[PDB]
Symmetry: D2
Subunit: 284 residues, 4 copies
């Protein structure tokens, strides 16, 4: 917080977190087959490791480094590797201090509901840096979904200092009292635009951590508004949005005055669609 | 319907459907690495094919037989093969007349939300036979989940004649007007027991086809009862139950007088739990 | 033999064999993810099948088509699939009428020593057409290695008529009585150039079929010459050349007056190297 | 050499090497899904690691531990993992200080000809201990083939002290001057029995290291005897025996007075067969 800031887009912010965590703890290593700019020439071959293996091999490799006492951050697109990751997570649930960075344009669907696995997705340069630092420092296995569309823009102020965004905590990106709009990743910005173009007071909640979901924050917002819209760009069917709506339909139906709306991606949401949805629930 | 009946458990009923569909259409073939009793000695090596391949190979093999003009029924436990099946389904959605029988004790989770893929799960010897026949005759790729726990019992009357249970159609296993209890597979019987031990009139809806879900039937039942409980033995989180609840929370919240309850399996429901749930919603 | 001829390079010759075998037998199908030019627009979607599967899936698919009574020709680079192919071959050795075309620039190493698997590699447009036709008509599983370097040139006279080059038979590409030079694929041409630039009479033997090896022809040539040079472009260590030399060192050492020379590829032969080798054995 | 000895079979000797190398260097770790008796209760969870991954994952895991500065010994049967191992070896050839122990009853065929990969196979409790220690201490990746048939017997004197058997060096298991009998693993004992039941003086050469082959020792023996028999239990076709014979047929044909004999396993050698072979070459 205090100190110099970078006017950074998400890629630069991730680059900052990696550089910082690596300078900070000799144990942190980066691996995989740019967000990693300058790490190699600064930390060397034994800290920045080109892994000429297939995804499972890289995963195994990262796991081996972790068992050896290191804190690996592996990049894996999962194009596939989930089988191995999910099993490790289940076992832990039932040691794996690793972070898998995976660019997203579904790896989400495959991991978001996995027990023992932490799944996070940043939405700003600020929480991209903050969440990655938190993920790296934690001892829990984490899949870090990076919305490729946010890599280049927008650019915002990012403190170069030591700060993290706590894993498992959602944030109110915009206070409002008529409608709760639960979202994450690239859609947070769309939700914020829509928030600005409607009459109703819209509270935008950015989940940040997709698993474990911060239900308290969501419940708090819905108890106030009584109206819920959930929006994400990943596949709608069976997606995270379905679980959130289901949890609200059982645990908090008494607080709703309107139908729960899900706006999500094709199985194989725009600002206008979100606006129409706000207008719709405001009828109740 | 008319004719001789067998007092059969689910395994015998599946055995009947296979024998019948094979006698009926020379194109139907069975493959894989007992539900298949007598087929080999009756139809031979070119109709009953032992496939010494891994799951993907068998899937590919079945697909090859289909492209060749045959109607294959392959047994695959998926212990893994989903990758290949899901892609084929997406492609079709975006030819694959095959049926994959897979014993279940999660293959469900991995397929239930797939576009272009038909997923069914029988609950009685009667619909086990009926659904399999419908699946085999159809031209759509189908995953046929067989609850291993129902293989041996219970035994019920199963016509040996020509009948099918239509794909994509849920059934009201027990008429009732106070509570809609949506379920499938082995849990249907538990729902029926619970139905008998409560004061309230419970309508048990057996989905039969998990994808595509018969939402009309579910909506019809909930419009009447105003109370919904969804129960399945597969993993609750991200499961089919989450989608159903979510669809009801958006499309039919106006018909509910009670919270939507999901009773499902550990991520890694008993008669008593269902009873407690009925009692709970009856408070609303 | 009788009739119209095409001045064709290897790719055109393979294209001719496929077109001919497909026109000839409705059962012949082509599949995979140009040597296949015009087949689609001439035979259609059910004969020319784009298989959107991974290599194993395609292999399984081809196997499924074969079990269904068809004669598939699948293209697989093996970049992996060998595991499945080798097992099928072992099983047969210990039904699989398929042909796998695989471009080569090692799939050879992995298959050449497999029991029950036929492995062939053409060297001219003439035997490219002839061998492929023989492979397709046979009931044995065959891997057809196509030296990519020969696809475009050279061009030679290729009868469009019905002829095959028998599987399992080597050919004397050039009669000679001082040195036997065993080779195949692209190296046949290099052997022929060398043959023309030395004093000694060099007999060039083109194996054509790599498995099962035509040892009789090789023995006949070596009994006459007493000198043996074996040349191939695939990895030398553990390659086909090692087996040939070993078989000659046990079964025919009595006919040799010179050391057995192997000229082959890096584990990870030029005209000049072959010439030097001829000169060397001619010293004995 | 000096000191206490154990009357040990091969399994006990491997158990001794592991215990010793682990006591000796904190960096040595053992992993995989008994030869490992007592290690866990003596070195603990971070040194003796149960790896719940598939073979590739374990390989990757072992590689990750190595990159982290440790010296892993992983058990992998390869039932598959070779793809990954071979690539790493090629890359090194073109860091991987790991040892993969693999029981054998073909993993040999798949690795013996790989550039940059060390492949060894012990034949006695004495060299089982010695070679494993050498493999562990070296920085080269090694596949350690353990003939399952020798695990229980025979038992022989094994010094508990610090000694290794040098990688890449064959040994003369029995001096002789009429016939060179090249062998390894379980067949060494059979060769030694045969040596005792023939008139001829048979020199038994135990390769010990299969890759890189100690050709000097083999050449030295053959220059003396002029007769060569090569025997191994792995598949004969394309096996190590083929390379040895081929190397001798080119580099040392001038020293032979008899045909080079290979006695090996079915593609899918007894004391009597070896005896007949000795008798045969003694005719020359």
């Amino acid at each position: 917080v205090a100190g110099v800031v970078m006017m950074a887009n998400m890629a630069k912010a991730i680059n900052m977190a990696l550089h910082e965590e690596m300078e900070r703890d000799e144990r942190v290593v980066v691996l995989g087959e740019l967000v990693t700019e300058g790490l190699y020439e600064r930390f060397g071959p034994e800290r920045v490791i080109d892994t000429p293996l297939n995804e499972g091999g890289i995963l195994g490799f990262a796991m081996g480094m972790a068992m050896a006492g290191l804190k690996p951050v592996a990049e894996i697109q999962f194009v596939l590797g989930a089988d191995e990751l999910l099993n490790h997570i289940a076992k832990l649930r039932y040691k794996a201090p690793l972070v898998v960075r995976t660019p997203v344009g579904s790896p989400e669907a495959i991991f978001v509901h996995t027990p023992g696995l932490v799944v996070v997705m940043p939405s700003t340069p600020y929480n991209a840096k903050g969440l990655l630092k938190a993920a790296i420092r934690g001892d829990d296995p984490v899949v870090f979904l990076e919305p490729k569309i946010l890599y280049r823009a927008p650019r915002e102020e990012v403190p170069e200092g030591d700060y993290v965004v706590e894993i498992g905590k959602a944030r109110v990106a915009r206070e409002g009292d008529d409608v709760t709009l639960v979202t994450y990743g690239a859609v947070v910005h769309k939700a914020l635009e829509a928030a600005e173009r409607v009459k109703a007071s819209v509270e935008v909640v950015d989940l940040q951590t997709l698993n474990p979901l911060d239900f308290d924050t969501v419940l708090k917002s819905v108890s106030k508004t009584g109206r819920l819209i959930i929006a994400h760009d990943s596949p709608k069917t069976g997606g995270l949005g379905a679980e959130v709506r289901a949890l609200v339909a059982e645990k908090a139906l008494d607080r709703l005055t309107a139908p729960v709306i899900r706006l999500a991606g094709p199985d194989v949401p725009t600002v206008e669609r979100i606006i129409k949805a706000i207008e719709y629930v405001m009828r109740y």
